[PDB]
Amino acid sequence: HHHHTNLCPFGEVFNATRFASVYAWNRKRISNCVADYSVLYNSASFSTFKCYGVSPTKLNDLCFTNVYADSFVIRGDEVRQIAPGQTGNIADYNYKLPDDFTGCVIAWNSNNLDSKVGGNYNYLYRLFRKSNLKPFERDISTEIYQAGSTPCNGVKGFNCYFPLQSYGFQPTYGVGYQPYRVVVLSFELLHAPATVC
């Protein structure tokens, strides 16, 4: 039974059995429903929950014209790169937030789900790239990165490196290298007088 009174399916985003790699991050659009962010913030299992341009307390009291739910995986030390005005291999080459970002960033350690003994190599991240990504740009290219002036012709080797690279998550790693599942909510405020929202 589907109705618009029904709440938005945030379970599908947070409660997925597996996330995408950060270089090819997923984007779900939540629309034509009623969202309740009270359950999200109240959860005591979110090690990172930073919101930009909007306080999480006034989320249910706000009017959005559009909502995006981006989800991926990185390692613990790389969580601090998922914020406006950051750099690093993740913010420059994998996922970049705008300087006027209006949304929230939700992260939780997922070492019981995305690390295997012997290394879970399923998750990848782009390491080599000529110029930085633009905000909300996804690069799934697999072209051999040419470092020198000698072309590589698609072949790996010296000055000719694969742009992607795996995390190899092992449960014995330090928390700075353990897998962390991330959900980034992008809001689209309604241009309306204060007397409304």
Epitope: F14, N15, A16, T17, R18, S43, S45, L113, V117
Partner: antibody, heavy 120, light 109 residues
């Protein structure tokens, strides 16, 4: 939370067969239903598992080239199919679920099972 | 794959005594283990998941423990409806889910 399998079957060796297992009350479209074999007096042996929404299998090495597992998320139903049955396949077949709970996994309901008897 | 081996094969415990069941993994499994109970003719029933967490609706006399490769299921104060076969299944997320052979719990005599 509720899974319902198909009724007991009886087939001659070499005949095709597919049993069903419908679920309900799942956390989200992305769960982990799994098939498990149990011979008359043997023990438990895992076979495969699917995420219906994604339909991504993970067949067990001892079962990969033998049975095919499919799913139809419209009816939230999981399937287990034999292209050619042999007498060794005579066993009880359960389906179990494994929902995700952010931090970790959690197995909930366990199918009542379907008895299969391959004999000519 | 990750071979699961249990011990002993079968045991014997009087009502009220403490049953002790072990489970060994061929390589580390962190803590993603689960104990089950299969009474004769019935479908298996989950008792412990995550090595130590008790399933909701299960008597508090059962308890699980361990980490890495060795684990233990303890049945404090054994009852008369506790006679079955107990297995240990691991469910590391991007891995073949493996199963133990089981252990049978009986009346001491």
């Amino acid at each position: 939370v509720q899974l319902v399998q198909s009724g007991a079957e009886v087939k001659k060796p070499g005949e095709s067969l597919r049993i069903s297992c419908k679920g309900s009350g799942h956390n989200s479209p992305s769960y982990w239903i799994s098939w498990v074999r149990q011979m008359p007096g043997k023990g438990l042996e895992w076979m495969g598992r699917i995420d219906p929404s994604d339909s991504y299998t993970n067949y067990s090495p001892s079962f990969q080239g033998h049975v095919t597992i499919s799913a139809d998320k419209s009816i939230s139903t999981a399937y287990l199919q034999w292209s050619s049955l042999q007498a060794s396949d005579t066993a009880i077949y359960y389906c179990a679920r494994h929902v995700v709970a952010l931090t970790h996994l959690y197995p909930d309901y366990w199918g009542q099972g379907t008895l299969v008897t391959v004999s000519s | 794959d990750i071979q699961m081996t249990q011990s002993p094969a079968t045991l014997s415990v009087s009502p009220g005594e403490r049953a002790t069941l072990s489970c060994r993994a061929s390589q580390s499994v962190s803590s993603t283990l689960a104990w089950y109970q299969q009474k004769p003719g019935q479908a298996p029933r989950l008792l412990i998941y995550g090595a130590s967490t008790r399933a909701t609706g299960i008597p508090a006399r059962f308890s699980g423990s361990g980490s890495g490769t060795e684990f233990t299921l303890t049945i404090s104060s054994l009852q008369s409806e506790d006679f079955a076969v107990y297995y240990c299944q691991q469910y590391n997320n991007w891995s073949t889910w493996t199963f133990g052979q089981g252990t049978k719990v009986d009346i001491k005599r």
